[PDB]
Amino acid sequence: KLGLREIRIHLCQRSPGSQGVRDFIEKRYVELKKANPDLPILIRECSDVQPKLWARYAFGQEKNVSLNNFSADQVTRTLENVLSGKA
Amino acid sequence: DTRPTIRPRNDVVHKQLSAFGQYVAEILPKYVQQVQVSCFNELEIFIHPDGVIPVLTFLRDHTNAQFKSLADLTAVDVPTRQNRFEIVYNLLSLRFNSQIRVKTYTDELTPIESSVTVYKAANWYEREIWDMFGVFFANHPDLRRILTGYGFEGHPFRKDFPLSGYVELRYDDEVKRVVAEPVELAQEFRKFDLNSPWEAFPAYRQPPE
Amino acid sequence: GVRTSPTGEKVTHTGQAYDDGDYRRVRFSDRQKEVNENFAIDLIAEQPVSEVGSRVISCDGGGGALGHPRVYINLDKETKTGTCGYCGLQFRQPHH
Amino acid sequence: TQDTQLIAVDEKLDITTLTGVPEEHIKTRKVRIFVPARNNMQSGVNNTKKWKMEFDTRERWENPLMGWSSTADPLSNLVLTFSTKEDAVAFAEKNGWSFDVEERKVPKPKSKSYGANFSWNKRTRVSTK
Amino acid sequence: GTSVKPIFSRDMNEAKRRVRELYRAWYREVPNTVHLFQLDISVKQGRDKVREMFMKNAHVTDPRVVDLLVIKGKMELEETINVWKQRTHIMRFFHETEAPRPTDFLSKFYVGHDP
Amino acid sequence: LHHALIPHGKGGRSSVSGIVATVFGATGFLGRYVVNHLGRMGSQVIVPYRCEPYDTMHLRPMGDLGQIIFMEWNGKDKDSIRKVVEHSNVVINLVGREWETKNFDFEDVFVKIPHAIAQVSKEAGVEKLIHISHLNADIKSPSRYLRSKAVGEKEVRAAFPEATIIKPSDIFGREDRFLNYFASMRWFGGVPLISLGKETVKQPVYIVDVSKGIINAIKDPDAKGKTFAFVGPNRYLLFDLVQYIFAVAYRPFLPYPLPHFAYRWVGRLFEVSPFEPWTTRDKVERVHMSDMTLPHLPGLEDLGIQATPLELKAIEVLRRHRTYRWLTSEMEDVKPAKTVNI
Amino acid sequence: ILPGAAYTEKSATYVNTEGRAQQTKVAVTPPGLAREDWKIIRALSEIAGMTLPYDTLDQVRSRLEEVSPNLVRYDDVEGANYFQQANELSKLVNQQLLADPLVPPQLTIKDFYMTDSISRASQTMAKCVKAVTEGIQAVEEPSIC
Ligand SMILES: NC(=O)C1=CN([C@@H]2O[C@H](COP(=O)(O)OP(=O)(O)OC[C@H]3O[C@@H](n4cnc5c(N)ncnc54)[C@H](OP(=O)(O)O)[C@@H]3O)[C@@H](O)[C@H]2O)C=CC1
Ligand SMILES: [Zn+2]
Question: CA torsion, points G39, G41, G42, G45, in degrees to nearest 10?
């Protein structure tokens, strides 16, 4: 089983490479959380880190979609792509 | 005397040593980098490693130096420097009743022209330097371990070599032969950090960086 | 004095005594467990409490240079006695 | 500025194979580069001016005999001193040792005024002297 | 900075050259050394132990370093040839008396806090 | 485990192994090796001895200070056995004698003494008792050595249920009285193999393999109650085995055939010696008897060990017996003898 | 019961309430047969079949970086943000207050001492709570050196 357990977003605070995800999170993150209140979206940020997405699936599986330099629309389109499959 | 405890200081020897220090510095400016006379009237000459042979030859053969006895040849391992090893020569002049110090520098992987040609006394001193520290010397006749046991690993006097060593010895009855095992001290060497956190000598106060 | 342990072994003044289940006891068999009998903890108690009519005293353990370094004890608290740290001899002000 | 058959030796210095250290004590040891803090009991600072190199501690059991603190790790009492972090951090991997480095803690300058002890308004006025 | 004068070899090619005949000088006398020192071990395990010692020093990629082991091995050959090392010194290479230290993480966790 | 018995260290001399051995009869062939293997790991071995303290001197430099403790014990005394095993984790039995002393016969030293050791150990409260008996232990074999051993192991099993019993086939080593015994027979003219030794089949086992087998049994948790059988990897016919001994020793070979009853007589003749006898009648029977294969009993390999062939460790024993003409010969000069299928 | 390692017996990674993630160092090895906490779990996973990837302290620290990159940035406060987004989410749902006054668990000194397992097992700490509870007369020793 690969049902969605948690989504981890690692973004840099000021790096232009992680600028796009910052544009996403101020606007669209709240609406995403209202859609999946049970889903633990993790936004553990850092400094000088390549903006990446970790998606923990059931039975201990983790995908490593990397949203480097992705714009806010790109970040959102990656998100619904990951959670499009309920399993 | 007003200084019954302070060791008396000689200025005439200081002037003579200082004058000779300038003399050697002008003679071979190709290797002599810096020269200093310590407070207790001892002269040190800082040469470049390539000048190991020419400088020693001049001190051995010049009519005004005649330093014809290598007292000892040792090195001080200072890891904080780029060239950790610091080879030191000590020569004595019988004719002029004086001693000189000639010191070079060397990293781990660099060979030094063996002074066996100039001072045949250096021959055995060279083996000790290589054995204790690992400094290889080119053109040495019989460069090999002198003090450490046969098949010894590492160089003991290096500051990064533990005092107790890596291997101890024991007679193993199963093989009926003395064998080597990893070290296991019955009581570990209790290191003592006994450096007072208060400045000792303001004269040698290194300026801040 | 010396107190014997329940396992049957003399207890040192430090309170050391091997447990019944302790394997490190076979050494003592066919030998004797060295222990001193003059327990300094006890012997110091028998020393009488000296009484001096002065606020402070100087104790050197007797013998001058053969004793401990000279210390000065403040015999002001009438509740208890002042004991030299080095040797343990007590002192007391007689009703001040 | 020295023509002594000079060749390009770009690759990093790897003297580890010559120091004679066994294989175990060359990877599984994590050295620490740090400026020792002043002994808080004292107030002098002459022991916090040189970078120190030390190896992580290991097992220290008790002898079946009187019971000293035995050990089996030779790299237990080895402490090295370096005058600059760069020299210290360079000596680690040159000898081939995994390291972690802690930056020097400089006591920040604090403005102290004696007149503040007796302040007309500020609560810094002391009640005893 | 990137350039420093060499020991014996100017690059890896001649440094590797000085390794080969050192291995040659180490291959030939192993049966002679075994005969000389009354080795319990046969000739065969002598030859690959020379091979294995030469093998473990393979990651070296520096001409100055390779010269240092090359000359150090030469002394080791010299010490062995003129009976300077006895049986105990020779048997030191064969780590016999010490028990094999297991390599799996589970065994290390069972025996002690060794990382 | 006790608070002072938790293992510590890295297996060296100063490391605390955590086993308090009580190796009985350690002043002997296997006793020397088992103490050494216990000595390396740092185990407080309580070695009892009845011989001269001088004969135990070689035992002293095998353990850290305070580890090897020497105690005086007597076979026919419960108090002595109790004194030595009162504080112990494991008790190792190694008492044995290839001949019958005036004060000690095979009955005394292979049944009576093991009975007292096993019975007292259980009363003391030890954990494991490792008892050793011959592989050829049998109740009906004429050799009283094998007959006594079979009775003793059954009795020890009754007194101490979870007592590991070791059944080595035949040890060979520096002082084995097995390879040395055959090599020493050059003095007596030729070698008088019984029936030319064409029927006896032996499976000698290296002494070091047995020693590590005992140590592995101590640390193993499944050794409780098992009955092991220690045998070498190969299996040799007697005539070819003696061929390998004399070829490795480079000594002349004279295969004298000698009748069994006559051999029993010369064994009687050599028995008369008050000192250490060269050979007894029981010894003659033993070398004449074969080593039966017992696959049901767990083998040496089950104790995480690999057996060592005799042809690999042969020069160790027979280098001494070689004269100056062959004192420097290599190991592979003599190839292994015939290997009957195991 | 599985004996673990104390904070003075392991090279751990603790994060303070301000976000700084600092690390401790092995002052002395754990007593007896007690082992390090992470090695216990990793060894347990290997026995159970589902062996974990990391096998060394660097490996698990690297894994710690993957889960949260700010757990490796030692002695560095990684400033968070997006307070407004957290505020907007808290506007969702409605939980009402209660009349119980805000009483901290520790009001005086006596209950500051006896908090955690190490403190509870301590002997010198028991004298302190004994001292503050009753008067001075219950705490005194012939203290000279
Ligand atoms: N091939 C073999 O020989 C095999 C032997 N075994 C068993 O191994 C054990 C030891 O063999 P090994 O070491 O070669 O024998 P050794 O004769 O070399 O040594 C025997 C040991 O037992 C002691 N001992 C014997 N009889 C007495 C006695 N009556 N009272 C006190 N101590 C006594 C001896 O003391 P001291 O030295 O003072 O005489 C010595 O310590 C024996 O039980 C033997 O049967 C098992 C399998 C194979
Ligand atoms: Zn006093």
Answer: 150
Contact (Cβ atoms closer than 8 angstroms) between residue B88 and residue B101: yes
Tokens of A54: 């970790």
DSSP string, F53-103: GGGGGGGGGGS-TTTSEEEE--TT-HHHHHHHHSS-SEEE-----SS--SS
Spatial distance between the Cα atoms of D78 and B79, rounded to a whole number of angstroms = 13
Residue D51's SS3 state is: strand
Q: Residue of the nearest CA to atom 11 in ligand 1?
A: F96
What CA–CA distances, in Å, run from F84 to C23, C32, F45, F46? 12, 16, 10, 7
Resolution (A): 3.5
What technique determined this structure?
A: cryo-EM
Report phi then psi at D63, rounded to 5: -65, 145
Q: Is residue B35 a contact partner of residue B92, using CB atoms and an 8 Å limit?
A: no
Ligand 1, closest atom to CA F149? 45
Q: Ligand 2 centroid to F275 CA: how many Å?
A: 70
Residue (of B100, E29, C96, D62) closest to F9 by Cα position? D62
CA distances from B71 to B90, B134, B135, F202 (A): 5, 21, 20, 71
Question: Radius of gyration over alpha carbons of chain G, in Å?
Answer: 22
- Which residues are CB-contacts of C41 (< 8 A; sequence separation ≥ 6)? C13
Q: Which of E65, E68, E88 sits opposite B177 (nearest CB)?
A: E88
Domain that holds residue A29: 2-87
Is C84 marked as binding a ligand? yes
Per CB-CB distance under 8 Å, the chain F contacts of G33 are 6-7
Please give the angle made by the CA atoms of E73, E77 and E83, to the nearest 5 degrees.
Answer: 145
State the Cα–Cα distance between residues F112 and F110, nearest whole angstrom.
Answer: 6
Structural element, H or E, at residue F129: strand F128-132
Short-list E110, E4, E22, CA closest to E70: E22
For residue F95, give the nearest of F46, F171, F152 by alpha carbon. F152
First CA to last CA distance, chain D: 67
Ligand 1 site, residue F29, Cβ cutoff 6 A: yes
**Distance (Å, whole) CA F192 – CA F184:** 12
Å from CA of F278 to ligand 1 middle: 16
Ligand 1 contacts CB of residue F19 (under 6 A): no
CA angle B91, B94, B95 (to 5 degrees): 125
Alpha-carbon span A44 to A54, nearest angstrom? 11
Report the number of distinct structural domains present in chain A.
Answer: 1
Rounded Cα–Cα distance for residues F148 and F108 (Å): 9
Q: Best of D70, D73, D75 to disrupt the F interface by mutation (most F CBs within 10 Å)?
A: D70
Q: Is C68 annotated as contributing to ligand binding?
A: yes
Token duo for residue F293: 């294969």
Bridge partner list, B171: B178
Residues of E in contact with F10 (CB under 8 A): 112, 114
